[PDB]
Design a protein around this motif. Structure first.
Motif, PDB file in Angstrom:
ATOM      1  N   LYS A 115     122.295 -38.043 134.022  1.00 62.93           N
ATOM      2  CA  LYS A 115     123.319 -37.697 135.010  1.00 62.93           C
ATOM      3  C   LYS A 115     123.462 -38.784 136.071  1.00 62.93           C
ATOM      4  O   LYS A 115     122.483 -39.402 136.477  1.00 62.93           O
ATOM      5  N   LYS A 116     124.693 -39.007 136.520  1.00 66.88           N
ATOM      6  CA  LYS A 116     124.980 -40.018 137.535  1.00 66.88           C
ATOM      7  C   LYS A 116     124.018 -39.932 138.721  1.00 66.88           C
ATOM      8  O   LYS A 116     123.725 -40.940 139.363  1.00 66.88           O
ATOM      9  N   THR A 117     123.539 -38.727 139.016  1.00 65.90           N
ATOM     10  CA  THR A 117     122.622 -38.530 140.136  1.00 65.90           C
ATOM     11  C   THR A 117     121.245 -38.062 139.668  1.00 65.90           C
ATOM     12  O   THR A 117     120.446 -37.575 140.468  1.00 65.90           O
ATOM     13  N   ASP A 118     120.966 -38.210 138.376  1.00 65.34           N
ATOM     14  CA  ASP A 118     119.677 -37.797 137.829  1.00 65.34           C
ATOM     15  C   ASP A 118     118.625 -38.879 138.041  1.00 65.34           C
ATOM     16  O   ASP A 118     118.941 -40.069 138.078  1.00 65.34           O
ATOM     17  N   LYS A 119     117.370 -38.460 138.168  1.00 64.98           N
ATOM     18  CA  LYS A 119     116.273 -39.398 138.361  1.00 64.98           C
ATOM     19  C   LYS A 119     116.135 -40.304 137.143  1.00 64.98           C
ATOM     20  O   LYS A 119     115.725 -41.459 137.256  1.00 64.98           O
ATOM     21  N   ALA A 120     116.489 -39.769 135.977  1.00 64.65           N
ATOM     22  CA  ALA A 120     116.417 -40.524 134.735  1.00 64.65           C
ATOM     23  C   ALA A 120     117.526 -41.568 134.665  1.00 64.65           C
ATOM     24  O   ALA A 120     117.311 -42.683 134.195  1.00 64.65           O
ATOM     25  N   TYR A 121     118.711 -41.198 135.142  1.00 66.87           N
ATOM     26  CA  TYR A 121     119.855 -42.105 135.139  1.00 66.87           C
ATOM     27  C   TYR A 121     119.551 -43.348 135.958  1.00 66.87           C
ATOM     28  O   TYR A 121     119.843 -44.467 135.537  1.00 66.87           O
ATOM     29  N   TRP A 122     118.957 -43.148 137.127  1.00 68.86           N
ATOM     30  CA  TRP A 122     118.611 -44.260 137.993  1.00 68.86           C
ATOM     31  C   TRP A 122     117.673 -45.204 137.257  1.00 68.86           C
ATOM     32  O   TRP A 122     117.901 -46.411 137.199  1.00 68.86           O
ATOM     33  N   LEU A 123     116.644 -44.621 136.661  1.00 68.35           N
ATOM     34  CA  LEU A 123     115.675 -45.361 135.875  1.00 68.35           C
ATOM     35  C   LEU A 123     116.360 -45.966 134.657  1.00 68.35           C
ATOM     36  O   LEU A 123     116.061 -47.090 134.259  1.00 68.35           O
ATOM     37  N   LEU A 124     117.296 -45.210 134.071  1.00 70.46           N
ATOM     38  CA  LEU A 124     118.028 -45.683 132.902  1.00 70.46           C
ATOM     39  C   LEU A 124     118.771 -46.964 133.256  1.00 70.46           C
ATOM     40  O   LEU A 124     118.685 -47.968 132.549  1.00 70.46           O
ATOM     41  N   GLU A 125     119.462 -46.933 134.391  1.00 69.12           N
ATOM     42  CA  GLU A 125     120.177 -48.100 134.885  1.00 69.12           C
ATOM     43  C   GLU A 125     119.171 -49.137 135.367  1.00 69.12           C
ATOM     44  O   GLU A 125     119.399 -50.343 135.277  1.00 69.12           O
ATOM     45  N   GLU A 126     118.051 -48.637 135.887  1.00 71.54           N
ATOM     46  CA  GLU A 126     116.982 -49.480 136.403  1.00 71.54           C
ATOM     47  C   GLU A 126     116.357 -50.323 135.293  1.00 71.54           C
ATOM     48  O   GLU A 126     116.148 -51.524 135.459  1.00 71.54           O
ATOM     49  N   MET A 127     116.061 -49.689 134.162  1.00 72.35           N
ATOM     50  CA  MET A 127     115.460 -50.392 133.034  1.00 72.35           C
ATOM     51  C   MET A 127     116.398 -51.471 132.504  1.00 72.35           C
ATOM     52  O   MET A 127     115.965 -52.572 132.163  1.00 72.35           O
ATOM     53  N   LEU A 128     117.687 -51.152 132.446  1.00 73.57           N
ATOM     54  CA  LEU A 128     118.687 -52.101 131.966  1.00 73.57           C
ATOM     55  C   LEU A 128     118.754 -53.317 132.883  1.00 73.57           C
ATOM     56  O   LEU A 128     118.735 -54.458 132.426  1.00 73.57           O
ATOM     57  N   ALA A 144     128.460 -54.118 129.781  1.00 72.50           N
ATOM     58  CA  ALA A 144     129.120 -53.158 128.905  1.00 72.50           C
ATOM     59  C   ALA A 144     128.360 -51.836 128.868  1.00 72.50           C
ATOM     60  O   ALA A 144     128.963 -50.763 128.869  1.00 72.50           O
ATOM     61  N   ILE A 145     127.035 -51.922 128.838  1.00 75.82           N
ATOM     62  CA  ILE A 145     126.190 -50.733 128.803  1.00 75.82           C
ATOM     63  C   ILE A 145     126.167 -50.035 130.157  1.00 75.82           C
ATOM     64  O   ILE A 145     126.127 -48.807 130.231  1.00 75.82           O
ATOM     65  N   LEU A 146     126.188 -50.826 131.224  1.00 70.89           N
ATOM     66  CA  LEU A 146     126.164 -50.284 132.578  1.00 70.89           C
ATOM     67  C   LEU A 146     127.335 -49.331 132.805  1.00 70.89           C
ATOM     68  O   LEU A 146     127.166 -48.248 133.366  1.00 70.89           O
ATOM     69  N   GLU A 147     128.522 -49.739 132.367  1.00 70.48           N
ATOM     70  CA  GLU A 147     129.714 -48.914 132.525  1.00 70.48           C
ATOM     71  C   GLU A 147     129.675 -47.718 131.584  1.00 70.48           C
ATOM     72  O   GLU A 147     130.031 -46.604 131.970  1.00 70.48           O
ATOM     73  N   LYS A 148     129.227 -47.947 130.353  1.00 70.20           N
ATOM     74  CA  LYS A 148     129.133 -46.874 129.371  1.00 70.20           C
ATOM     75  C   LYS A 148     128.237 -45.759 129.899  1.00 70.20           C
ATOM     76  O   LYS A 148     128.436 -44.585 129.588  1.00 70.20           O
ATOM     77  N   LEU A 149     127.257 -46.140 130.713  1.00 73.08           N
ATOM     78  CA  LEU A 149     126.332 -45.184 131.305  1.00 73.08           C
ATOM     79  C   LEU A 149     126.989 -44.456 132.473  1.00 73.08           C
ATOM     80  O   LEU A 149     126.758 -43.264 132.684  1.00 73.08           O
ATOM     81  N   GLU A 150     127.813 -45.177 133.231  1.00 73.46           N
ATOM     82  CA  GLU A 150     128.505 -44.593 134.374  1.00 73.46           C
ATOM     83  C   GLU A 150     129.323 -43.377 133.949  1.00 73.46           C
ATOM     84  O   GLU A 150     129.521 -42.446 134.730  1.00 73.46           O
ATOM     85  N   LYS A 151     129.793 -43.392 132.707  1.00 72.35           N
ATOM     86  CA  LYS A 151     130.586 -42.290 132.177  1.00 72.35           C
ATOM     87  C   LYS A 151     129.700 -41.240 131.510  1.00 72.35           C
ATOM     88  O   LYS A 151     130.129 -40.109 131.283  1.00 72.35           O
ATOM     89  N   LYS A 152     128.461 -41.616 131.205  1.00 67.39           N
ATOM     90  CA  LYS A 152     127.521 -40.699 130.573  1.00 67.39           C
ATOM     91  C   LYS A 152     126.862 -39.801 131.615  1.00 67.39           C
ATOM     92  O   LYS A 152     126.388 -38.710 131.300  1.00 67.39           O
ATOM     93  N   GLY A 153     126.836 -40.269 132.859  1.00 67.15           N
ATOM     94  CA  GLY A 153     126.234 -39.499 133.929  1.00 67.15           C
ATOM     95  C   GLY A 153     127.121 -38.361 134.393  1.00 67.15           C
ATOM     96  O   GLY A 153     127.062 -37.257 133.851  1.00 67.15           O
ATOM     97  N   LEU A 154     127.943 -38.629 135.403  1.00 66.91           N
ATOM     98  CA  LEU A 154     128.846 -37.619 135.943  1.00 66.91           C
ATOM     99  C   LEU A 154     128.063 -36.473 136.577  1.00 66.91           C
ATOM    100  O   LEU A 154     128.201 -36.270 137.803  1.00 66.91           O
TER     101      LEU A 154
END
Length: 87
Positions: A33-46, A77-87
């Motif tokens: 989720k865009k505001t999930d702890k995992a999302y941050w880490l998900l974007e963080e790992m990338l 490309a992945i960063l944006e793809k994730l932005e839409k996966k969160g929400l």
């Protein structure tokens, strides 16, 4: 000894790029989720892998500059793809 293909340090560029490939496949699954702890880490790992590849100083290496730029583009490309996966 022998000429062989693919230099020694170039292998790292592959190793790092190979990591990005796995991260991309993970994003497709990632139901974070865009505001999930995992999302941050998900974007963080990338961003982390991008930070590693963008840490080399180099000077006159065209191969590195080309691979470095191409690698960063992939993260975009992945960063944006994730932005839409969160929400």
């Amino acid at each position: 000894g022998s000429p062989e293909f693919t230099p020694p340090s170039i292998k790292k560029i592959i190793h790092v790029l190979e990591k990005v490939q796995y991260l991309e496949q993970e994003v497709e699954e990632f139901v974070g989720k865009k505001t999930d702890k995992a999302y941050w880490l998900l974007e963080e790992m990338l961003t982390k892998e991008l930070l590693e590849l963008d840490s080399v100083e180099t000077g006159g290496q065209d191969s590195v500059r080309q691979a470095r730029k191409e690698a960063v583009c992939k993260i975009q490309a992945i960063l944006e793809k994730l932005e839409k996966k969160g929400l």
